[PDB]
Design a protein around this ligand. Structure first.
Ligand SMILES: [Zn+2]
Lengths: 73, 86, 81, 186, 95, 81, 77, 46, 74
RNA sequence: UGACCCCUGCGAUUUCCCCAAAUGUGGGAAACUCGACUGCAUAAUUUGUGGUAGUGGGGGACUGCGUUCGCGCUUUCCCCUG
């Protein structure tokens, strides 16, 4: 049960890709061995150009597909 | 478990869940069925939407590849391994 | 368990259907705990494709949809273990 | 294509229009319910158990424990010792059990047909107090190198008491494997 | 599991009194059953054995499905082996 | 551990390509590798199913959600092989 | 360091209306006040409302449960 | 440390510790004997 | 409102009518009979709804867990 | 390919006793040590129990919108193909 080495992305602005062609963008604050990530200042980033900020959110690792760091870590 | 050991180094064609065919030299495996192919080439069957034309094949060279068992459907022998003798 | 019973069907001929609609008819030669089966002298028929005869084929258990076993199989005697 | 962008032209439908089962009175074959090497064994275990229980009732009706010629003396005075070494001479058992008090009579049980020593005897002391004094000390004694246990004989004192062959007794030296420790004594 | 000992019979009581008892009672009374699978096809037949993985051993099965006007197609399989993951719904004879 | 996992650990630090179940293919330098197939890359080139591409700097990918990986052919010369 | 378990516990104590996304489904979402949760991520709501992006209709469900595997993204209010 | 003693009656070996009341664990017999030493012993055959 | 975990919630839901929606739209409403450690539901006198509208009546129905989308009482 | 006949299966190590061509070659006992041999944590997010369903394609008649007249979307019947 070794957790992932995501210490590099801690406190960095990322853009995550989800299963159903959905994307989000927020700052990472913590992770878990099951890739359960907690990102704050998250935006929904729907299919359209419209943007909706809600802030603190949680994402399930089973549905998290990819995470890119916009701040190059 | 000689069923897999006897087939080491042979030129196997792996069938993917999406319908693709990865033909490469099966080097090694594991309990999860994660295979290692050398000089692999990817083939895919595209349906003809223009008229009754022969199936369109789009080959793609990859080299060394690591296929996940969960994504591996089946595998068969396309031909013997590359003979090193002249 | 029951996979042991699946592993006991060696040297018999069956027809397996896959989750992608592919059909495979051949004789079983070996099975593992993960349901992966190896069929020799087998004929595969992919969806919207032509049948092809393969001398060997190692299939994974996850992509298997179901099997079709012979009619004379002794179920009552083979399920004792 | 991708699982999300795949256009499902005919997604999974229900089963409401596909109920064509067989009628109720068309019951299943009754004789098609059995298994081999699973029920015949339970049947043999039940027969051997009932057969023994019936032999138990016949033995209880024929033989009377209290009305036994071998048994003599007061029941509260008599004592019971088992796990005794077969080589223990009568004099050796006297020298070991007269210490707690004088012994009026000593009885070594023997096999009726084989004649071999059973391994347990009944000792009748002159005074009931000598017996009670022996109850606590005698248990756990070592005679001829083999540990022996000692408890007041309940065959004619305790209500509803019977030996192994009749389903009663104490001690589990031959009970379920790894369930009764051999070190512990009665 | 809650009973990490190797002598645990949790699967036993599960199949005897849990939701999976439908298959035990099905094999007991030799009653038919209709199964809806991920193939969009329904398989109607009897059961002879199963386990925790929901893999049943069927006999005298009848596969049925529909394509597209919608045209129905059916066939028969006297002996087969169905997987559990691909199962969607099970329905015993409601009679 | 597994032989493919070991081949990945030694493949750490070189340019590799990775295709995921969603179809996207990412080719770039590998930074960190783990037993659970979790791969981190840098300065990658992404190709989507439609064909469009993009530019990224630092990326991490879950292992279970990967279809396959392409590693340098020179790795075939490893001492274990 | 805040973890998802502690954050879910905070939202639970706060009784805030948490919205949840579906796995492989983008058009439908569910919102309700969480009552409890297990390690499997299954969540129970007191008064759930199923909202769709295309229809914008909020279907009332009441006290319900939702599987953790189907969850994709949590959102406050 | 072990201090094996031989019981008089049952001739059984048994450990005994200091301050331990002297009694064979096996037969409750109160007479014991020290085991023959291990020291090297020699005898000119005179 | 004290915390009520999903397992006790479903346990209390046992015996009462419940409708469950599947990942592909179809729904099933019936008297909850029992569940297992994996949430394999078994209903009685179940009625199948297709695309929200009533489709028909099935009866006793055993359904796996990994196929259902959600569950709701009544 | 293979009847009959042998062990119920360990690569390595430790101690006791014994046969012995007596430092080797072997047998009767256990001891707890590595192996990825099996069962359960393994059907509850990371492979060993699914949101990768397989749900089509093409030839004739048969609608409409845009049009570069090649086509993108869209609506019907008969045929070959899986
Ligand atoms: Zn002694």
């Amino acid at each position: 049960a070794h957790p992932p080495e995501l210490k590099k992305f801690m406190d960095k602005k990322l853009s995550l890709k989800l299963n159903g062609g959905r994307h989000v963008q927020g700052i990472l604050r913590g992770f878990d061995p099951f890739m359960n990530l907690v990102i704050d200042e998250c935006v929904e980033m729907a299919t359209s150009g419209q943007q909706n900020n809600i802030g603190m959110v949680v994402i399930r690792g089973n549905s998290i597909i990819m995470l890119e760091a916009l701040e190059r870590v | 478990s000689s069923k897999m050991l006897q087939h080491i180094d042979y030129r196997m064609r792996c069938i993917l869940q999406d319908g693709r065919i990865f033909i490469g030299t099966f080097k090694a495996f594991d309990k999860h069925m994660n295979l290692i192919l050398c000089d692999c080439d990817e083939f895919r069957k595209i349906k003809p939407k223009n008229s009754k034309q022969a199936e369109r094949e789009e080959k793609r060279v990859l080299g060394l590849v690591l296929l996940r068992g969960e994504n591996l459907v089946s595998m068969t022998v396309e031909g013997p391994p590359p003979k090193d003798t002249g | 368990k029951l996979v042991r019973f699946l592993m006991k069907l060696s040297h018999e001929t069956v027809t397996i259907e896959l989750k992608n609609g592919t059909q495979v008819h051949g004789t079983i030669t070996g099975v593992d705990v993960s349901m992966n089966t190896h069929l020799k002298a087998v004929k595969m028929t992919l969806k919207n494709r032509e049948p092809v005869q393969l001398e060997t084929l190692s299939i994974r258990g996850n992509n298997i949809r179901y099997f079709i076993l012979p009619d004379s199989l002794p179920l009552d005697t083979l399920l004792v273990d | 294509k991708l699982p999300h962008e795949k256009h499902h032209n005919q997604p999974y439908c229900g089963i409401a229009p596909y109920i064509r089962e067989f009628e109720d009175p068309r019951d299943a074959p009754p004789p098609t319910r059995a298994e081999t090497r699973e029920e015949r064994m339970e049947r043999k275990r039940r027969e051997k158990i009932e057969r023994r229980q019936q032999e138990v009732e016949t033995e209880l009706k024929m033989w009377d424990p209290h009305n036994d010629p071998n048994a003599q003396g007061d029941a509260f005075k008599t004592l019971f010792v088992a796990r005794v070494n077969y080589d223990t001479t009568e004099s050796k058992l006297r020298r070991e059990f007269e210490v707690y008090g004088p012994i009026k009579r000593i009885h070594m049980v023997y096999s009726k047909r084989s004649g071999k020593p059973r391994g347990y005897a009944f000792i009748e002391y002159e005074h009931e107090r000598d017996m009670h004094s022996a109850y606590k000390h005698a248990d756990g004694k070592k005679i001829d190198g083999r540990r022996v246990l000692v408890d007041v004989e309940r065959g004619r004192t305790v209500k509803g008491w019977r030996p192994r062959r009749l389903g009663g007794g104490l001690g589990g030296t031959r009970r379920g494997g790894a369930d009764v420790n051999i070190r512990h004594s009665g | 599991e809650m009973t990490p000992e190797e002598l645990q019979k949790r699967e036993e009581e599960e199949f005897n009194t849990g939701p999976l008892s439908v298959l035990t009672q099905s094999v007991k009374n030799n009653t038919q059953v209709l199964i809806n699978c991920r193939n969009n096809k329904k398989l109607l037949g009897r059961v002879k054995a199963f386990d925790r993985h929901c893999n049943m051993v069927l006999e005298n099965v009848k596969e049925m499905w529909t394509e597209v006007k919608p045209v129905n197609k059916d066939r028969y399989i006297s002996k087969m082996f169905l997987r559990g993951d691909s199962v969607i719904v099970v329905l015993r004879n409601p009679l | 551990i597994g032989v493919p996992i070991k081949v990945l650990h030694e493949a750490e630090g070189h340019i590799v390509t990775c295709e995921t179940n969603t179809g996207e293919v990412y080719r770039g330098k590998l930074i960190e590798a783990e037993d659970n197939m979790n791969c981190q890359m840098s300065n990658i080139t992404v190709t989507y199913r439609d064909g469009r591409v993009a530019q990224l700097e630092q990326v991490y990918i879950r292992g279970s959600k990967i279809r396959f990986l392409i590693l340098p052919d020179m790795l075939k010369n490893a001492p274990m092989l | 360091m805040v973890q998802p378990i502690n954050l879910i516990f905070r939202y639970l104590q706060n009784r805030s209306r948490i919205q949840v996304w579906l796995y492989e489904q983008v058009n439908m979402r569910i919102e309700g006040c969480i009552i409890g949760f297990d390690e499997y991520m299954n969540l129970v709501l007191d008064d759930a409302e199923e909202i769709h992006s295309k229809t914008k209709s909020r279907k009332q469900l009441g006290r319900i449960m939702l599987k953790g595997d189907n969850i994709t993204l949590l959102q406050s209010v | 440390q072990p201090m094996i003693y031989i019981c008089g009656e049952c001739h059984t070996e048994n450990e005994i510790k200091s301050r331990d009341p002297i009694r064979c664990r096996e037969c409750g017999y109160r007479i014991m004997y020290k085991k023959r030493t291990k020291r090297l012993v020699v005898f000119d055959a005179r | 409102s004290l915390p009520l975990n999903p397992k006790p919630f479903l346990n209390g839901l046992t015996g009462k009518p419940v409708m469950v929606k599947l990942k592909w739209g179809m729904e099933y409403k019936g008297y909850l009979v029992s569940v297992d450690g994996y949430m394999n539901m078994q209903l009685a006198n179940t009625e199948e709804y297709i695309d929200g509208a009533l489709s028909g009546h099935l009866g006793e129905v055993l359904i796996r867990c990994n196929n259902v989308l959600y569950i709701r009482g009544v």
